[PDB]
Ligand SMILES: Nc1ncnc2c1ncn2[C@@H]1O[C@H](COP(=O)(O)OP(=O)(O)OP(=O)(O)O)[C@@H](O)[C@H]1O
Ligand SMILES: O=P(O)(O)O[C@H]1O[C@H](CO)[C@@H](OP(=O)(O)O)[C@H](OP(=O)(O)O)[C@H]1O
């Protein structure tokens with residue numbers, strides 16, 4: 001139906017127009033969505049209708065991806081081997097911003113994870129925190145991680161911070177599709193067509209794609225869709241430089257492993273379909 005409906009039962013506000021949603025405007029994301037509407041990836045991302053003012057503040061006017069579905073099931077998959085910008089590494093060296101909450105989260109998952117100095121600081125840098133999150137999840141090894149699942153009743157989970165092995169990820173998707181062969185086949189067809197689009201996209205070869213997700217949406221009528229969302233940390237490469245999006249990240253090469261992630265994700269869903 002609508003995302004704001006699920007919200008009722010952060011950055012998102014109800015739109016005036018049926019089948020639209022408002023997302024708080026960020027300059028990187030507005031730049032990306034404008035380019036994407038003119039790119040091969042146009043159909044792989046939510047429709048971007050421009051910017052509107054509400055309570056004297058700027059919102060992206062977006063397609064509500066849940067609008068076509070009857071009681072949608074949603075899964076958010078964060079794509080990439082790296083989940084922070086390289087500029088965040090520089091700032092953390094020259095001008096660190098210590099984070100006490102991020103320290104507490106770590107203790108909880110692994111008490112021996114923080115160093116003697118982080119313990120004494122009771123705090124860590126964001127990039128250190130994001131690197132640790134990448135290693136305890138599937139991000140480092142598979143190039144994606146499950147962030148959360150939602151359902152139209154209000155029922156939601158984000159309890160995936162240690163979902164890491166290929167088989168752990170497969171078991172989350174197995175539970176998400178609840179044995180619906182038609183939804184799984186449609187998800188796999190959509191991912192195959194997205195991969196093909198990414199591999200020819202002018203936008204994609206010219207941009208570092210960090211912190212974006214693939215949003216999986218399906219319903220009990222067997223409707224299934226997948227879209228790329230969240231371009232808040234997607235930045236152009238300089239001087240017409242390009243990425244392959246599969247090779248390992250090494251500080252300075254700005255590689256995101258996005259397609260390593262999509263290759264693995266397709267392989268897991270193809271595996272699930274043969275079980
Ligand atoms: N166009 C859309 N239509 C419907 N639901 C959407 C849309 N975009 C995002 N959502 C929902 O909102 C969630 C958050 O989206 P997104 O990642 O863009 O926002 P964010 O505020 O940057 O979140 P985060 O910091 O968790 O990445 C998605 O996982 C999905 O449930
Ligand atoms: O544990 P979760 O909720 O996934 O949060 C973490 O992951 C978010 C992205 O999903 C980060 O956001 P961003 O890097 O801006 O995309 C967030 O960072 P911050 O605390 O807002 O500075 C970080 O604490």
Ligand SMILES: [Mn+2]
Pocket residue numbers: 211212213229230
């Ligand atoms: Mn996001």
Ligand SMILES: [Mn+2]
Pocket residue numbers: 230231232
């Ligand atoms: Mn964001």
